[PDB]
Design a protein around this ligand. Structure first.
Ligand SMILES: Cc1cc2nc(CCNC(=O)c3ccc(-n4cnnc4)cc3)[nH]c2cc1C
Ligand SMILES: [Cl-]
Ligand code: NA
Lengths: 235, 57
């Protein structure tokens, strides 16, 4: 995240960080004690992932972190990295042993399709992650967060040569300087509704982070809520 | 006055459904209960989703 601020402990208790070949390479969000939602381009059936919930400062043990192994990876059935690494860019991770929910490890709410879309239409969400703090710069040690406004579709289209479909949205600022960045992919875009946060997007991609005239590109969660709820149901 | 889900979400804190006789029915996500005022959402489990519970100083 470029232009963000350090999160306080427990401020985004649904955030997770993913570790694999390289540590802290993508984000994710807690759906429930056994399931994480992330970007499909972050993951791959066969490559070993660990999830860390309750994380704040990746270089200090703060006695809230819960590490889990991933036993199943479910990319969306329409994801096909051979055609497009970024379309239908969403995946679910099943944990080996359940998380212990507490004030530092708390699920994100997920509304139905209609309300998730209404909440995105409010026009202002929060993104968070341990991604780069400058374009091509160092990654964060302390979780970063940032409020981003929803950008109009035509502005979003004129900003990049790559295609933005109706299942993706843009967010960020006309002057740049405030955006998600590499390493934040898979993390949450949430909308606060009277003190309860709901998942409205998955951080997906961009080009030059925070460059004036460019915007972060996000997966619209509303299009996938029914699939998330079906795959992650514990009862 | 007019009471519908399209106007201020029916004054529901989370979700609204239109019902009979110019009335609405509010509801909440998993882990919350609709409060006695019929509009607000209260926690119904120890760690409900989407809530910050750690003191923010
Ligand atoms: C906001 C953001 C900015 C980023 N910049 C990078 C590194 C540069 N990446 C790119 O330049 C890049 C990303 C996606 C595409 N693409 C192809 N087809 N549709 C989209 C092409 C190129 N990763 C980021 C991740 C994020 C989340
Ligand atoms: Cl209820
Ligand atoms: Na830590």
């Amino acid at each position: 995240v470029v232009g963000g601020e350090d999160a306080k402990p427990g401020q985004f208790p649904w955030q997770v960080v993913l570790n694999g070949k390289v540590d802290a390479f993508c984000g994710g969000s807690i759906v429930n004690e056994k399931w994480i939602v992330t970007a499909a381009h972050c993951v791959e059936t066969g490559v070993k992932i660990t999830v860390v919930a309750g994380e704040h400062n990746i270089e200090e043990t703060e006695h809230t972190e819960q590490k889990r192994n991933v036993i199943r990876i479910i990319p969306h059935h329409n994801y096909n990295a051979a055609i497009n690494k970024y379309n239908h860019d969403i995946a679910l991770l099943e944990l080996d042993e359940p998380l212990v929910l507490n004030s530092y490890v708390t699920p994100i709410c997920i509304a139905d399709k209609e309300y998730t879309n209404i909440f995105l239409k409010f026009g202002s969400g929060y993104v968070s992650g341990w991604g780069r703090v400058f374009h091509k710069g160092a990654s964060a040690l302390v979780l970063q967060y940032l409020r981003v406004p929803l950008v109009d579709r035509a502005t979003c289209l004129r900003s990049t040569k790559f295609t933005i479909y109706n299942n993706m949205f843009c967010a960020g600022f006309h002057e740049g300087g405030r955006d998600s960045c590499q390493g934040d992919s898979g993390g949450p875009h949430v909308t606060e509704v009277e003190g309860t946060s709901f998942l409205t997007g998955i951080i997906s991609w961009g080009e030059e982070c925070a460059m004036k005239g460019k915007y972060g590109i996000y997966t619209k969660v509303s299009r996938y809520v029914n699939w998330i709820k079906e795959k992650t149901k514990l009862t | 006055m007019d009471v519908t889900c399209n106007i201020k979400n029916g004054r529901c804190e989370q979700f609204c459904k239109n019902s009979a006789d110019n009335k609405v029915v509010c509801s909440c996500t998993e882990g919350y209960r609709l409060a006695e005022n019929q509009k607000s959402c209260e926690p119904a489990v120890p760690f409900p989703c989407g809530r910050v519970s750690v003191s923010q100083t």
